[PDB]
DNA sequence: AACCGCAATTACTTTTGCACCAACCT
DNA sequence: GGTTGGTGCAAAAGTAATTGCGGTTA
DNA sequence: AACCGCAATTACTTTTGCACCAACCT
DNA sequence: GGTTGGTGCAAAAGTAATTGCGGTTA
């Protein structure tokens, strides 16, 4: 039955926060309306706390991801010193796979 | 202030319908919480009526779009009778632009 | 007070024409 | 140079959503 | 009864290695 | 044949969301 995205769930939290409900009250309303396990009290309090500060964005904060192992300036210098060089030759010197070279050359 | 998608708005309608609210009641709750012009009574009744039948999908029904002016079987036959023929030659015979021929040849 | 039929208006859908293009051909 | 398949994007051609007014049921 | 700090767990993010490939080269 | 740039996708390496338990304020 329950087909809602995280964004749709969070919009209902925001609606409920703006109606003046307490988070524990909103939790009960959501489990009654959509069924058990729709909302957790602690999660609703975590969101209400963000809303109460004026942060009404329903998105996650940005995640930087895996740190890059390639220095684009070094790659630029290796290419400028030898423009003939293949991706497999650059990869051996840079201790990466040639596909990482291919992908980073598209960036620069 | 108001940043919600149609899908987020519709999820709030569904929540409210499942809480046992009347559509005119939900309309007032949404305009009070998010501000004037957030919801219209007639629209909320149109959605509640779909929900009441058991249709709890928050998507629009599919739209077929512009009707196609090209017969793919004819295009297949023109190509099979003369494989040498260019998109501009096929377009002249089919009363379309060559780009429609290009696009429809990708389909088949 | 609430909902709904109806119809006018708005927003979406997919497809097409024209302008313009780069790679390949002549 | 010319030819060719291909794409960006506005206009086109459709269906379904949006919603104000008046009727009907409460 | 409700919220929150804290920490364990889960879900997401972007990047990389390896397997495998088709077009072009030798 | 071999070489080459390129992609699919699983594994990797990160940050932030999710949430149960115990403390604190009511």
Answer whether A15 touches B (CB < 8 Å): yes
Which domains can be identified in chain B, with CATH numbers?
A: 8-57 (1.10.10.1450), 76-108 (1.10.10.10)
Helix (H, G, I), strand (E, B) or coil at B3: coil
C-alpha–C-alpha distance, residues B14 and A12, integer Å: 10
- Report yes or no: B13 and B45 within 8 Å, Cβ to Cβ: no
A87 contacts: CB under 8 Å, gap ≥ 6 = A98, A99, A101, A102, A105
| 3-class secondary-structure state, position B85 | coil
Enclosing H/E stretch for B79: helix B72-81
- Count helices and strands in chain A by DSSP H and E runs: 6, 0
Q: Looking at residue A53, what DSSP letter applies?
A: T
Tokens standing for residue B93: 């015979």
Footprint of strand F on the protein (CB under 7 A): A 6, 40, 42-43, 46-47, 60-67, 86-88, 98-99, 102-103, 105-106
Distance of CA B29 to the CA centre of its chain: 29
The answer to whether the Cα torsion of A66, A72, A78, A82 is positive or negative is: positive
Q: How far apart are CA A85 and CA A79, in angstroms?
A: 7
Q: How far apart are CA A25 and CA B37, in angstroms?
A: 27
What is the CB neighbour count within 10 angstroms for residue A82? 12
SS3 A61: coil
Query: How many angstroms separate the CA atoms of A48 and B70, rounded?
Result: 55
Q: Rounded to an integer, what distance in angstroms lies between the CA atom of residue B17 and that of residue A107?
A: 50
Residue A62 three-state SS: coil
Nearest-Å Rg of the Cα atoms of chain A is 25
**Which chain D positions come under 7 Å from a protein C-beta?**
3-8, 12-21
> A32-49 b/e with 16+ CB inside 10 Å = b?
ebbeeebbeeeebeebbe
Which has the closest alpha carbon to A12: B62, B1, B14?
B14
Task: Say if CB A39 and CB A66 are below 8 A apart.
Answer: no
């Amino acid at each position: 039955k329950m087909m809602l995205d995280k964004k749709q769930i969070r919009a209902i939290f925001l609606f409920e926060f703006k109606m003046g409900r307490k988070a524990a009250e909103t939790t009960r309303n959501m489990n009654n309306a959509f069924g058990p396990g729709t909302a957790n009290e602690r999660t609703v309090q975590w969101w209400f706390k963000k809303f109460r500060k004026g942060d009404e964005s329903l998105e996650d904060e940005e995640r930087s991801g895996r740190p890059s192992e390639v220095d684009n300036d070094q790659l630029r210098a290796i290419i400028e010193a030898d423009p003939l060089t293949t991706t497999r030759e650059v990869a051996e010197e840079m201790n990466v796979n040639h596909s990482t070279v291919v992908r980073h050359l598209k960036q620069i």
